């Protein structure tokens, strides 16, 4: 359960 940065979108996404 963490926020990972997505270089493609320029935003963080929530992952498990």
């Amino acid at each position: 359960g963490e926020w990972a940065y997505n270089p493609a979108t320029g935003k963080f996404a929530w992952t498990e």
Side-chain angles (χ1 to χ4, degrees):
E2 54 273 89
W3 290 103
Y5 175 70
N6 186 331
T9 62
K11 298 179 184 175
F12 288 90
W14 181 256
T15 184
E16 181 60 83

